From Swiss-Prot, chain A:
Family, per entry: Belongs to the peptidase T1B family.
Keywords for this protein: Cytoplasm, Nucleus, Proteasome
Physiological role: Non-catalytic component of the proteasome which degrades poly-ubiquitinated proteins in the cytoplasm and in the nucleus. It is essential for the regulated turnover of proteins and for the removal of misfolded proteins. The proteasome is a multicatalytic proteinase complex that is characterized by its ability to cleave peptides with Arg, Phe, Tyr, Leu, and Glu adjacent to the leaving group at neutral or slightly basic pH. It has an ATP-dependent proteolytic activity. PRE3 and PRE4 are necessary for the peptidyl-glutamyl-peptide-hydrolyzing activity.
Record-level GO cellular component terms: cytosol; nucleus; proteasome complex; proteasome core complex, beta-subunit complex; proteasome storage granule
Domain of life according to the entry: Eukaryota
Gene, per the UniProt record: PRE4
Keyword Ion transport: no
Name used for this protein in its record: Proteasome subunit beta type-7
Chief localization: cytoplasm
Swiss-Prot record, chain E:
Location of cross-link Glycyl lysine isopeptide (Lys-Gly) (interchain with G-Cter in ubiquitin): K69
Lineage: Eukaryota, Fungi, Dikarya, Ascomycota, Saccharomycotina
InterPro entries, alphabetized: Ntn_hydrolases_N (IPR029055), Proteasome_beta_3 (IPR033811), Proteasome_bsu_CS (IPR016050), Proteasome_sua/b (IPR001353), Proteasome_suB-type (IPR023333)
Stated family: Belongs to the peptidase T1B family.
Modified residues annotated as Phosphoserine in this record: S30
Molecular-function annotations in GO: endopeptidase activator activity
Record keywords, A-Z: Cytoplasm, Isopeptide bond, Nucleus, Phosphoprotein, Proteasome, Ubl conjugation
Function noted in UniProt: Non-catalytic component of the proteasome which degrades poly-ubiquitinated proteins in the cytoplasm and in the nucleus. It is essential for the regulated turnover of proteins and for the removal of misfolded proteins. The proteasome is a multicatalytic proteinase complex that is characterized by its ability to cleave peptides with Arg, Phe, Tyr, Leu, and Glu adjacent to the leaving group at neutral or slightly basic pH. It has an ATP-dependent proteolytic activity. This subunit may participate in the trypsin-like activity of the enzyme complex.
Cited Gene3D superfamilies: Glutamine Phosphoribosylpyrophosphate, subunit 1, domain 1 (3.60.20.10)
GO cellular component, one term: cytosol
Localisation: Cytoplasm; Nucleus
GO terms under biological process: proteasomal ubiquitin-independent protein catabolic process; proteasome-mediated ubiquitin-dependent protein catabolic process
Protein name: Proteasome subunit beta type-3
Keyword Transcription regulation: no
Swiss-Prot record, chain G:
Gene field: PUP1
Swiss-Prot/TrEMBL GO biological process terms: proteasomal ubiquitin-independent protein catabolic process; proteasome-mediated ubiquitin-dependent protein catabolic process
Family statement drawn from the similarity comment of this UniProt entry: Belongs to the peptidase T1B family.
PANTHER family reported in the protein's UniProt record: METALLOPROTEASE TLDD, PROTEASOME SUBUNIT BETA TYPE-7
Miscellaneous comment in the UniProt entry for this protein: The side chain of Thr-1 acts as a nucleophile, and the N-terminal amino group acts as a proton acceptor. Present with 11400 molecules/cell in log phase SD medium.
Alphabetical list of InterPro entries matching this protein: Ntn_hydrolases_N, Pept_T1A_subB, Proteasome_bsu_C, Proteasome_bsu_CS, Proteasome_sua/b, Proteasome_suB-type
Organism: Saccharomyces cerevisiae (strain ATCC 204508 / S288c)
GO function terms (MF aspect): endopeptidase activity; threonine-type endopeptidase activity
Enzyme Commission no: 3.4.25.1
Full protein name: Proteasome subunit beta type-2
GO CC, alphabetical: cytosol; nucleus; proteasome complex; proteasome core complex, beta-subunit complex; proteasome storage granule
From Swiss-Prot, chain H:
Family that this chain belongs to: Belongs to the peptidase T1B family.
Location in the cell: Cytoplasm; Nucleus
Catalytic activity as recorded in UniProt: Cleavage of peptide bonds with very broad specificity
Active-site residues, Swiss-Prot/TrEMBL: T1
Disulphides: none
Annotated protein name in UniProt: Proteasome subunit beta type-5
GO cellular component: cytosol; nucleus; peroxisome; proteasome complex; proteasome core complex, beta-subunit complex
EC class name: hydrolase
Binding site for bortezomib: A49
The enzyme's E.C. designation: 3.4.25.1
Subunit (UniProt): The 26S proteasome consists of a 20S proteasome core and two 19S regulatory subunits. The 20S proteasome core is composed of 28 subunits that are arranged in four stacked rings, resulting in a barrel-shaped structure. The two end rings are each formed by seven alpha subunits, and the two central rings are each formed by seven beta subunits. The catalytic chamber with the active sites is on the inside of the barrel.
Length: 233, 222, 125, 196, 204, 195, 226, 212, 195, 196
């Protein structure tokens, strides 16, 4: 049993017609202190999977090393390591999910909420969640922390059920994700303007976008707001 | 302090027929006031004509089902591909649950299938492994909303035959699979109206001598 | 300071008359005429707006007052006494009825409350 | 919350962020923490929003009744009324208030009233959760008798840093300028101050 | 410890076609111990009926209080109180004890004498009104009652059909609650006649 | 105090109350009468916290006696029980509540009927054919449920009461030093000196 | 609970869901959360349901008396001031969280009030367990100079986000529109997207199913003449 | 819960209720509170259901291994002590058990051992365990005799559970009866308390307070 | 369990132990023998937490019986009491201590003397002419201090023991259901079946 | 405690105050918080003195044994060993360590290791109780590729402010310069830095 120290906030994600999108800001908070502004919380595994992690950053770095070690281990005595016997998103997730549940069962959890986004060998979209309790679930949209409360409602307006996935394009899906990141910047006190976004498409592969910023923000109306009730000036 | 348990909501319902059995459960998965997933399967086909669900804390629920499925696999290896009877599965699950007596699987487990005489069977477990064969059993969040209704409509409790005035009970006539599914659907529709954690979808697994069949139905998403 | 008049200023005279009440009625008699007529499908109340000066805006001085949405009042006698009675009548319709029963009082009961206030000024210290 | 008040040559300027949080949720991202108790006596509010609003409203009442009888009150008088409320009710209040005002006789004055209910007259004052991160900056960069443009830059740069590091602070930088000329409101948006 | 589940018991109320029905169990207990099988929880003031679940001393106290208040109401108004008005009175009376409340779950039921409209209402311990069209539930088996009522209920039932629905809703809910049962009473209320029926049920 | 029983038979009410008074480690008395006569045909037994029990009982006694003098009339057992309930209901939301449970056995001279009322410290009143407070009912009610009849004589009621006391003396860990038994009927209140 | 308020061109609109809950149990499936303080000053409440109802009735009562006393139509700032000073006095023990909106001779207004007595001004606001879902929608679609039709659409969409995504909110959408120089229009059950489907079976019992011990006529009538 | 067991001329009567509760919620009315350890030994269930089920089923396995090794029926004393020694090892861990281990052998005759999760092991003639034990004890103590017939003894056990089922809120549902003889136990059926109550009320004349 | 007494007279040791076994609310047994014969001339009575008492007593019994067989010789009461003390002294610093108090009454055949040893759960041994555990001494020691003589006969010791039990039955709140009395002398151990 | 490490053109400089407190009592006013784990790999220590000394001693052992086998370790390697100890024993440690070192290949490098046991490579790092008050100042005044004299002034001015506001910090400002030229110790006294 511990308490989280340096933390990462919301990770958000959704399925679209040919793959999955996942995004997370580049902030490592230290309580209310916005300590580290250059933290990458989306970690790609191969060319077909991206693991997005929130919560304790020291545990994230540990998980990051486990995944790096997993790729090395898979390549051992494996001529098809870059082909038929390459790591799948489903393999990577199940491994993490096992670790998360084992660790919670020893009363020493990895203090995280993880979303594994990827595309399988047969082109199927993979999107599944796991957290410090070892709880797992899948959905057309998935989000951690504040994202669950604010991002999901917006993303679910695009893909409300399974049948909406083939109707959703990458441009529409990316637009929804980028808007959700703006909303989280407005309303989450532990978020930053800078973020990373990753798209895993079955045709165009893994596209990893760094150094993105929240833009087209509405603040002008603030000038008109005066006082807290009766004050006119 | 770290709390290793959580509540993922959900409600499940097992009913034993004359020559069949059904195990139903909603597909909604939640934490607190948020919805994690509108479709997250909760009732599972475990092989050997047995269906299972472990409702409550989803991580422990998944762990138990996984371990039981594994137990079925190794039962085949060790005992010449012998079919695991529902009563044997039930006793095996008791030992899995009681194995963690002092750090329990925080779930209410129900399995369903057919006994060795071909009759419908449902077994119900508490978190630490006490179990019993039962005709009718709702589990989870809206269990208190469903069971009284089932006492009345399945077992005909408090119902008497008109004219006699409390002297002759209503006879316990056998229900068909179509009749049971109606009561299951109405139970979950009612539970959805009055319980916030119940909704989205209803998935029913029907077990007969022919095998395991699935049926899905929409529920209110609010 | 302190209100040291804790005794009744209205008392029975040897003849059985309550002087101050009689004299109050005399003040009402000097007051401007007001009337009320009840119809089958309504009630009407009316009075003259005796303007003290032509420079005065008689619209601001309201002799006829809404007590509840379904109850109205008019008077004859001393205007200031009326004005405070209307304020008390409006408040008592809420405090001793609407805040209890969630509805406005019936005419007779609101009248009863107003009557009680006027009775107390006839016996209190 | 990040708030400050700075005296300069022509008078005094009050500065504040616009973020109000309930835990990690931003309940209001366009809050106005610069509030008026008299024509040219304003205050910056930090701590319990309910408490500081209740206090400010009472002070405004007191100074309004003061003005009706004795004419315009001094900035010192306003600070005293704030202090009296904060000190006497210290057990039931979580309020950190900076009082700033402009007289013609005394010119720009700044008083800070922390949790305890004490009063401290200063050339400038900083307060709120975000103030911790700019004690070093403000102490190194503050000068007495600055111009209006210099003081606006000082407050803008200071609160910019406070906002950058404090998660509890953010949104727009509001400012109120108090001089003989009158009362001027200013606002500065994220795209302006973040790039500084 | 929890005042609302020391004594136990339940009340349910339903609307029908030109009629209302209100019903209650008869149990009073001291936690596990059954004390009385004749503790009725439904009272009436004129044609307005009031069911009260919860702490038994408060059930008794509030009944005496509303008898007190409706009697004075009648003397001054020169007419019997109506269900809509009484509901507001119950709400006001509970909220005036906001920071020291009666631990009860009241249920109003009756027909407006002038309009003939069937009316039911429920309250939390603190006075918040629940004015439902279909049904109101209260007591230690309220979850069970919600489940029974939600499935068994259909609108515009005739008095003699409504009796069967509310009776079966109560009985089967009480049989799934340890602190409810030991007999039951059902009131069938019409504009100018009221029938009261004691039900036969298991006594465990 | 510990055990107080009550049983209403055909033409009378019988109250049995334990004699022991224990102050933690020692039994200070074994002849304590846990009852007060409220009026000639109304008796109240009591059990609860020390001091409160007697203070309450005597306070009630004084009030009923005051009413008897003022009106030159004896209140019905129902009227007395309602008065007592209200005092306890008033008490439970006080600064320091009376921690007292009572049984009120009375004979109504108007209706010519015996009446037994059970009231706990919360103000929970119930009219019963037989009653108890605390753990006493747990041992005795199964026997009373079995044997009780509404047309029992006073002698039969005492025999059933002896069976209840015997079961208490067997299965209760505490030694309550036997019981004092009193009968309330049309002729008034009298004590059964041999039991 | 999900409640929202949205300012527009010539007025303000408030909206709310219609679910009231006892923990995880739905007590009323069509609750009325839009309360009237005065004819053209309405508010929506969240938190302790009795407190929101009670505090609006009390202030609404005092507002009416004040309106009669001053011969003036009531102002939103008066309702705001009376509410906050009352709630502050009780130090959050009165669990009322309100969104107050209305029109008066000064103009159109929109405020929020928290249980401890703090108030906020805004063009768009949301309160309750579904406030985060609702605020996400408001932050995504709100703009300056909204029309009446756009504000009703935005407000109801914000409530829907709460209805679907928040378990504490559900059933229907209530709306009230307060425009300047007009009567406020209360739109009860403006949307009804959660009607229960027909059941698979009728559970009407045969008459005489229930066992009965005794029958009797209850005397509801007064004591009779002769 | 209410469970009893008593020794008499004809062996042992075992009687239990059938109710299971989680707080006020009645989880079941059809629970089996008699564990059939083997054809000769019975065990009652009170406190923790899983603890009783698991370990008394386990006890049956140990009794089977004993008579395989020793070629002789295990004594009631030896069987009960295997269980008590086991739970005593777990003392402090939080096991919840209150049971009667009942049997009839040649060397001992009819024997009842009360076994506890505190490690208590008591031989006795009459035992009642559960939330409704006090009610059952009253009926037993007043009507018990050694020279009871098998018919009357069965009724006494049935009537005593009924007494508890009525008064105790956490007891009821139905009554399960067993008669233990030297040649083994004999099941004497499930008896719904709802139907049994009215039947007993009418035939016996008891429960006059209750309106029927 | 509750009350255990011991008294060493001229030529024997007398141990009196209560018969009651209570499980919180109910008295489950009223004929319980709270003692074990460790050897032909050594008896140990015991009282403490449930389960631990009998488990400990039987464990000691087995060990002394084992020693008796191995050496074909009966250990002296002093030797047995020292062995018992060490087990309890070992127990008190264990993961879960035995919560058991004992009296060891024995007749030393070598010295031709009766011996009474009192040992509590901590391992606190004392040799005494008369002893008790728990609250038993509070009621009885004043009587024993007064009447006791080292040259008392067995019959006189029993009379003094009856007086102690009578005082317990009068002033103790708990009903311990009387006592089983056993005498340990040169001829061995025997039970006084009427007391 | 106020500690920092800053990379510059020629390498890296570690800076620290010298105050160690037990409550409000200054147990040591001349503490050396700049400690050596290898020839040109040093660290700044904050948190539990027992923990950080125990950790540093273990790291020095590890890097000494590393050097015997594999030659000079990288600054990254040293930071990894620190991290491994701090992360794996996070439940029983209260340590906040900044690791700074000079290679010829990599030049000046700075790694910070906060309570959790995470690692963050930065151009410069600040830590300790006094660091809170200079986040604003350091962010505004830091430049990459500064000269030796500029970096010494930056650290001196920064820690001067940290000391001024933090009661837990004080005494002398110690510094250690790590370049190709070698290892240079510097010290600055109160009379020097207070007047800045
Ligand atoms: Mg919802
Ligand atoms: Mg029962
Ligand atoms: Mg064993
Ligand atoms: Mg340490
Ligand atoms: Mg210093």
């Amino acid at each position: 049993t511990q308490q989280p120290i340096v933390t990462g906030t919301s990770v958000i994600s959704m399925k679209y017609d040919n793959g999955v999108i996942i995004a997370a800001d580049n902030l490592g908070s230290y309580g209310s202190l916005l300590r580290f502004n250059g933290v990458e919380r989306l970690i790609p595994v191969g060319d077909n999977t991206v693991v997005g992690i929130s919560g304790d950053i020291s545990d994230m770095q540990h998980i990051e090393r486990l995944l790096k070690d997993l790729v090395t281990e898979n390549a051992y005595d494996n001529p098809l390591a870059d082909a038929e016997e390459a790591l799948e998103p489903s393999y990577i997730f199940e491994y993490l999910a096992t670790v998360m549940y084992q660790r919670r069962s020893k009363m020493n959890p990895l203090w995280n909420a993880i979303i594994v986004a990827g595309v399988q060998s047969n082109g199927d979209q993979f999107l599944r969640y796991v957290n410090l309790l070892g709880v797992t679930y899948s959905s057309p949209t998935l989000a951690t922390g504040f994202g669950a409360h604010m991002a999901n409602p917006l993303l679910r307006k695009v893909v409300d059920r399974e049948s909406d996935i083939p109707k959703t394009t990458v441009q529409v899906a990316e637009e929804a994700i980028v808007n959700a990141m703006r909303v989280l910047y407005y309303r989450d006190a532990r978020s930053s303007r800078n973020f990373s976004l990753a798209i895993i498409d079955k045709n165009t592969g893994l596209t990893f976008k760094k150094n993105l910023q929240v833009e087209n923000m509405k603040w002008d109306f603030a000038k008109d707001i005066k006082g807290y009730g009766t004050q006119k000036i | 302090q770290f709390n290793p348990y959580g509540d993922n909501g959900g409600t499940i319902l097992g009913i034993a027929g004359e020559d069949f059995a059904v195990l139903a459960g909603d597909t909604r998965n939640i934490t607190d006031y948020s919805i994690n997933s509108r479709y997250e399967p909760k009732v599972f086909d475990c092989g050997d004509n047995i269906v299972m669900s472990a409702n409550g804390f989803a991580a422990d629920g998944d762990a138990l089902v996984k371990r039981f499925k594994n137990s079925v696999k190794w039962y085949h290896f060790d005992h010449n591909d012998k079919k695991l009877s529902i009563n044997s599965a039930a006793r095996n699950i008791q030992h899995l649950l009681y194995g963690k007596r002092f750090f329990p699987y925080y779930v209410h487990t129900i399995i369903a299938g057919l006994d060795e005489d071909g009759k419908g069977a449902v077994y119900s477990f508490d978190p630490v492994g006490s179990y019993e064969r039962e005709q009718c059993r709702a589990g989870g969040a809206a269990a208190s909303l469903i069971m009284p209704f089932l006492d009345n409509q399945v077992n005909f409790k408090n119902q008497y035959e008109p004219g006699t005035n409390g002297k002759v009970k209503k006879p316990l006539k056998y229900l068909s699979v179509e009749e049971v599914i109606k009561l299951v659907r109405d139970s979950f529709t009612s539970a959805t109206e009055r319980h916030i954690q119940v909704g989205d979808g209803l998935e029913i697994l029907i077990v007969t001598k022919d095998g395991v069949r699935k049926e899905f139905y929409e529920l209110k998403r609010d | 300071m302190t209100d040291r008049y804790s005794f009744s200023l209205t008392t029975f005279s040897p003849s059985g008359k309550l002087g101050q009440i009689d004299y109050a009625l005399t003040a009402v008699k000097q007051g401007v005429t007001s009337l009320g007529i009840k119809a089958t499908n309504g009630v009407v109340i009316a009075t003259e707006k005796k303007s003290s000066s032509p420079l005065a805006m008689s619209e601001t001085l309201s002799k006829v007052s809404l007590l509840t949405p379904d109850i109205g009042a008019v008077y004859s006698g001393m205007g200031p006494d009326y004005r405070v009675l209307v304020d008390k009548s409006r408040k008592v319709a809420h405090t001793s009825y609407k805040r209890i029963y969630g509805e406005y009082p019936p005419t007779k009961l609101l009248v009863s409350e107003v009557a009680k206030i006027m009775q107390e000024a006839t016996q209190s210290g | 919350t990040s708030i400050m008040a700075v005296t300069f040559k022509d008078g005094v300027i009050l500065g504040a962020d616009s973020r109000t949080t309930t835990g990690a949720y931003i309940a209001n991202r366009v809050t106005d923490k610069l509030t008026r108790v008299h024509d040219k006596i304003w205050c910056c509010r930090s701590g319990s929003a309910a408490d500081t609003q209740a206090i400010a409203d009472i002070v405004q009442y007191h100074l309004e009744l003061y003005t009706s009888q004795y004419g315009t009150p001094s900035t010192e008088t306003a600070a005293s009324v704030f202090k009296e409320l904060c000190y006497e009710n210290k057990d039931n209040l979580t309020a950190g208030i900076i009082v700033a005002g402009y007289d013609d006789k005394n010119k720009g004055e700044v008083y800070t009233i922390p949790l305890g209910g004490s009063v401290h007259k200063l050339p400038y004052a900083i307060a709120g959760s975000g103030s911790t991160f700019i004690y070093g900056y403000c102490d190194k960069n503050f000068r007495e008798n600055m111009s209006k443009e210099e003081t606006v830059d000082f407050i803008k740069h200071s609160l910019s840093q406070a906002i950058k590091w404090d998660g509890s602070s953010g949104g727009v930088i509001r400012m109120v300028v108090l001089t003989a000329a009158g009362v001027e409101r200013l606002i500065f948006y994220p795209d302006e101050y973040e790039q500084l | 410890s929890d005042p609302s589940s020391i004594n136990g018991g339940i009340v349910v109320a339903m609307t029908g076609k030109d009629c209302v029905a209100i019903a209650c169990d008869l149990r009073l207990g001291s936690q596990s111990l059954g004390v009385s099988n004749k503790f009725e929880k439904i009272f009436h003031y004129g044609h307005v009926f009031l069911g009260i679940t919860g702490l038994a001393t408060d059930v008794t106290t509030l009944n005496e209080m509303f008898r007190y208040k409706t009697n004075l109401y009648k003397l001054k108004e020169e007419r019997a109180i109506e269900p809509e008005t009484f509901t507001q009175l119950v709400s006001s009376s509970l909220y005036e004890r906001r920071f020291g409340p009666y631990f009860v779950g009241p249920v109003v039921a009756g027909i407006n004498s002038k309009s003939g409209k069937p009316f039911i209402a429920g309250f939390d311990l603190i006075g918040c009104i629940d004015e439902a069209k279909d049904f109101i539930v209260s007591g230690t088996a309220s979850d069970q009652l919600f489940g029974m009522c939600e499935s068994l209920y259909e609108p515009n039932l005739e008095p003699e059909d409504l009796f069967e629905t509310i009776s079966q809703a109560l009985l089967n809910a009480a049989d799934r609650d340890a602190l409810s049962g030991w007999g039951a009473v059902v009131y069938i209320i019409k504009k100018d006649e009221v029938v009261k029926r004691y039900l036969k049920m298991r006594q465990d | 105090m510990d055990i107080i029983l009550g049983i209403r038979v055909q033409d009378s009410v019988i109250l049995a109350s334990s004699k022991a008074v224990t102050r933690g480690i020692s039994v200070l008395k074994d002849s304590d009468d846990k009852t007060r006569q409220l009026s000639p045909h109304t008796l109240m037994s009591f059990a609860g916290e020390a001091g409160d029990t007697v203070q309450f009982a005597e306070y009630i006694q004084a009030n009923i006696q005051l009413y008897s003098i003022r009106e030159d009339y004896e209140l019905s057992p129902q009227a007395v029980s309602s008065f007592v309930r209200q005092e306890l209901a008033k008490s439970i939301r006080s600064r320091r509540p009376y921690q007292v449970n009572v049984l009120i056995g009375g004979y109504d001279k108007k209706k010519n009927k015996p009446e037994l009322y059970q009231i706990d410290y919360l103000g929970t009143k119930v009219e019963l054919p037989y009653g108890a407070h605390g753990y006493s009912g747990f041992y005795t009610f199964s026997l009373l449920d079995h044997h009780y009849r509404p047309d029992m004589t006073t002698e039969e009621g005492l025999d059933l009461l002896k069976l209840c006391v015997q079961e208490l003396e067997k299965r209760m860990p505490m030694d309550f030093k036997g019981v004092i038994v009193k009968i309330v009927d049309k002729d008034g209140i009298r004590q059964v000196d041999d039991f | 609970t999900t409640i929202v308020g949205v300012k527009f061109n010539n007025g303000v609109v408030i909206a709310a869901d219609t679910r009231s809950t006892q923990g995880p149990i739905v007590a009323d499936k069509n609750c009325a959360k839009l309360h009237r303080i005065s004819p053209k000053i309405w508010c929506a409440g969240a938190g302790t349901a009795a407190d929101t109802e009670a505090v609006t009735q009390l202030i609404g009562s005092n507002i009416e008396l004040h309106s009669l006393y001053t011969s003036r139509e009531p102002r939103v700032v008066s309702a705001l001031q009376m509410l906050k000073q009352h709630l502050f006095k009780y130090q959050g023990h009165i669990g009322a969280y309100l969104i107050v909106a209305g029109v008066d001779p000064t103009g159109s207004h929109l405020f929020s009030i928290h249980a401890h007595g703090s108030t906020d001004v805004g063009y768009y606001l949301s309160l309750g367990s579904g406030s985060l879902a609702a605020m996400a929608v408001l932050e995504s679609h709100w703009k300056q100079d909204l029309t009446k039709e756009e504000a009703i659409k935005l407000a109801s969409d914000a409530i829907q986000a709460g209805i679907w995504n928040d378990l504490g909110s559900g059933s229907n959408v209530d709306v009230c529109v307060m425009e300047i120089g007009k009567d406020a229009e209360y739109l009860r059950n403006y949307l009804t997207p959660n009607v229960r489907e027909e059941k698979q079976k009728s559970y009407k019992f045969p008459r005489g199913t229930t066992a009965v011990l005794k029958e009797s006529i209850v005397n509801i009538c007064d004591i009779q003449e002769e | 819960t209410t469970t009893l067991a008593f020794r008499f001329q004809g062996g042992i009567i075992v009687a239990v209720d059938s109710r299971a509760t989680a707080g006020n919620w009645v989880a079941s009315q059809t629970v089996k509170k008699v564990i059939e350890i083997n054809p000769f030994l019975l065990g009652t269930i009170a406190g923790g259901a899983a603890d009783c089920q698991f370990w008394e089923t386990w006890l049956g396995s140990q009794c089977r291994l004993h008579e395989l090794r020793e070629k002789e029926r295990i004594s009631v004393a030896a069987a009960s002590k295997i269980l008590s020694n086991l739970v005593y090892q777990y003392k402090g861990a939080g096991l919840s058990m209150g049971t009667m281990i009942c049997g009839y052998t040649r060397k001992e005759g009819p024997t009842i051992y009360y076994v506890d999760s505190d490690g208590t092991r008591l031989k006795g003639d009459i035992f009642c365990v559960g939330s409704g034990q006090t009610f059952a004890y009253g009926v037993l103590d007043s009507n018990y005799k050694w020279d009871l017939s098998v018919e009357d003894a069965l009724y006494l056990g049935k009537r005593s559970i009924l007494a508890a089922a009525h008064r105790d809120a956490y007891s009821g549902g139905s009554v399960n009866l067993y008669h233990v003889t030297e040649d083994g136990w004999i099941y004497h059926g499930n008896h719904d308390v709802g139907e049994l109550f009215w039947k007993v009320k009418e035939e016996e004349g008891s429960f006059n307070n209750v309106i029927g």
